[PDB]
């Protein structure tokens, strides 16, 4: 097939392709209408001389035309509303890119998402299953149930009728005993529990289905507190000493001159080695020498500084300046930083040297 494709490659004699701007989402309709016009025009005195029309999906807002001349393309596209903008300018696709144009490329559960509108908006959720055909997805999140409503036994429709002046309930784990005490009816369906036409998990999470358009799937990232309620990576920064644990050049310590993502491709400077090597993240390891400052970005006690009396293969040991207690952390989680720990407060609730009233 590949050999025949070689003989099928384009040439000067073969007709060319031109790009034409068009409205978004109407490429199929435009192409069908164009063919109906050309077939109608076949019996007329002026037949369209364009050889073919392409409406790719991966590309949006554009249609391509195969024709002998641009004037032929112009005549073909004339009279079409969606091609009004395109008619002013026709772009000549290069021969090399024509094949790329024809080429097409054809190709998640337990992911964090958010909601756009509704009473559950601004609530983090985890995906359970996605049904593209039905355009709906299942999200497990912290339930929002009002206990006063259950106590007073108000209808959901009435609540929606008077929703204008009613405050939304907070986020709390579902409890069956609480509703039993409040007098509400609780039904059991296997692992899930049915209450007011909704399935609740034993743990307390609320599972519900919502439209993809309503759901948010871009620019979404949970917070640490949210992850706590619901409950590889590397930390390499400039000016840090790393060792080459694996590879031909082993037991060599270099400085982190650069930083990248999956493949860091650092340029380490080893002892008596002016030249810089190339190592990926997995080959790279974080190791430090004895009697040096170390900071922990992530760990049991993050944002802490200490000095290491030893360095075990996987359990580095340091002493926090805050208190004389041992602290064992992953060497990868460890870092070297001559700078003192800033200890900046989070959320600026209180400032350094700020009066507070613990008791009157």
């Amino acid at each position: 097939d590949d050999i025949t494709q070689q003989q099928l490659l384009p040439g000067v004699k073969d007709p060319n392709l031109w790009t034409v701007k068009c409205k978004i989402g109407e490429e199929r309709a435009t192409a069908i209408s164009l063919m109906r016009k050309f077939i109608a025009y076949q019996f007329t005195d002026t037949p369209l001389q364009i050889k073919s029309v392409v409406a790719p999906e991966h590309v949006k807002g554009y249609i391509y035309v195969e024709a002998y001349k641009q004037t032929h393309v112009k005549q073909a596209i004339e009279g079409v509303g969606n091609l009004r903008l395109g008619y002013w300018n026709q772009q000549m696709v290069p021969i090399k890119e024509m094949t790329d144009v024809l080429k097409v490329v054809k190709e998640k559960p337990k992911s964090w998402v958010r909601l756009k509108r509704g009473i559950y908006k601004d609530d983090i959720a985890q995906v359970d299953y996605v049904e593209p055909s039905q355009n709906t997805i299942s999200l497990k999140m912290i339930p929002r149930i009002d206990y006063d409503r259950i106590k007073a036994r108000m209808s959901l429709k009435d609540w929606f009728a008077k929703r204008k002046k009613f405050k939304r309930p907070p986020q709390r784990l579902f409890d069956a005993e609480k509703i039993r005490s409040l007098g509400g009816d609780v039904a059991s369906d296997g692992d899930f529990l049915i209450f007011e036409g909704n399935r609740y998990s034993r743990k307390g999470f609320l599972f519900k289905s919502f439209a993809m358009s309503a759901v948010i799937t871009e620019g979404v990232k949970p917070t640490l507190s949210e992850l706590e309620k619901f409950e590889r990576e590397h930390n390499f920064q400039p000016g840090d000493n790393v060792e080459v644990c694996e590879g031909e050049l082993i037991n060599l310590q270099g400085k982190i001159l650069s930083v990248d993502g999956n493949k860091i491709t650092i340029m380490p400077k080893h002892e008596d080695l002016k030249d810089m090597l190339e190592f990926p993240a997995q080959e790279l390891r974080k190791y430090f020498k004895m009697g040096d400052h170390v900071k922990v970005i992530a760990g049991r006690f993050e944002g802490d500084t200490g000095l290491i009396v030893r360095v075990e293969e996987n359990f580095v040991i340091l002493f926090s300046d805050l208190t004389m207690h041992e602290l064992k952390v992953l060497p990868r989680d460890l870092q070297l930083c001559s700078e003192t720990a800033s200890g900046v407060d989070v959320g600026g609730q209180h400032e350094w040297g700020e009066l507070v009233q613990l008791d009157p």
């Binding site: 097939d1 494709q5 099928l8 384009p10 040439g11 073969d14 007709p15 392709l17 199929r28 309709a29 192409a31 069908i32 164009l34 063919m35 109906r36 050309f38 077939i39 369209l48 364009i50 050889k51 073919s52 029309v53 392409v54 409406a55 790719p56 999906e57 991966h58 195969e66 024809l102 080429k103 097409v104 490329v105 054809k106 190709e107």
Partner: protein, 115 residues
């Protein structure tokens, strides 16, 4: 105008013809050039088995003989019409064997790269 799909809904692309039509149009007429072998007309099931609703792109061939894109898609021999850029799936194994007995080579229309 018969070759042209009647509407944008219920669109499908032939796994062999590489032609794009609607299921009802396929049943009424079928492939312009694939009728003798496929026998699509007269059986809705045959239409389902020979055409898939998942396809990528469409190109209309006004003159396949002199159309380079048609030559690239190997639809130059076919009469002018609307042909999909690529189709998903493959024809039934039994139909592949009958085509082999008939002496007509079968080639997959899955031109799109898989990743």
């Amino acid at each position: 105008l018969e070759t042209v799909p009647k509407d944008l809904r219920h669109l499908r692309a032939c796994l062999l013809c590489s032609l794009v039509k609607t299921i009802d149009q396929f049943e009424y007429d079928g492939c312009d050039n694939c009728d003798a072998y496929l026998q699509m007309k007269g059986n809705r099931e045959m239409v389902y088995d020979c055409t898939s609703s998942s396809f990528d792109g469409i190109i209309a061939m006004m003159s396949p003989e002199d159309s380079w894109v048609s030559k690239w898609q190997r639809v130059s021999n076919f009469k002018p019409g609307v042909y999909a850029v690529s189709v998903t799936g493959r024809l039934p194994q039994g139909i592949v064997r009958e085509l082999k007995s008939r002496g007509v080579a079968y080639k997959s229309r899955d031109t799109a790269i898989k990743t």
